[PDB]
Design a protein around this ligand. Sequence first.
Ligand SMILES: CC(C)(C)OC(=O)N[C@@H](Cc1ccccc1)[C@H](O)CNC[C@@H](O)[C@H](Cc1ccccc1)NC(=O)OC(C)(C)C
Lengths: 99, 99
Amino acid sequence: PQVTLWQRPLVTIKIGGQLKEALLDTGADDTVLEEMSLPGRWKPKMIGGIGGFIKVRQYDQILIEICGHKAIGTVLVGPTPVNIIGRNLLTQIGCTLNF
Amino acid sequence: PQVTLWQRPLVTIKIGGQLKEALLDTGADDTVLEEMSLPGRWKPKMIGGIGGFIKVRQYDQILIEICGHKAIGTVLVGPTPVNIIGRNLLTQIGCTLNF
Ligand SMILES: CC(C)(C)OC(=O)N[C@@H](Cc1ccccc1)[C@H](O)CNC[C@@H](O)[C@H](Cc1ccccc1)NC(=O)OC(C)(C)C
């Protein structure tokens, strides 16, 4: 696909046969998902965004599917208002910015 | 051009006769820049990011060159760790997300 920016670039993700809405964010280095209980150990972490930091839990090697394109990597889970797919995952699906 | 995301999508912009580096951010609805004295009449505004709200000065109808492409629109000036080019200006330059 070719996603236009007239509207926020919100797509469907599948994180364990759960369809989830998430934003493709080129501005984000990391992937941040809404509070969820994932099996596995996590590492405490504080991530900064415009505005300040938020405390998140870090999970390694999560598999997510972005428009039926698989990506596997680190995800931070915390109280975000929106799921954010960051460049750590977008690089996996071959995502580019073209102008 | 075709920007890959192995690294942050940093481009050089020209604004108010100043060359600056800014991130192309499909996650941002608006363009927020580092503190600067741009010419004109501004209005205070508050905008939220993942860590909470910040106060910005809003400047309308400002000319900005992104990789030599012309864009004229709103620019928010405020306490940001990085200059960010949002979707109000990425659409003007014809940028897309592709995979
Ligand atoms: C998500 C996270 C991993 C925490 O990365 C950033 O927030 N990265 C910042 C850049 C940054 C680096 C270092 C320090 C501070 C900021 C990008 O603007 C992220 N794209 C912005 C996008 O996530 C956010 C989506 C959003 C919107 C509203 C609420 C919550 C979240 N929009 C965003 O902040 O938009 C404005 C900049 C216009 C405020």
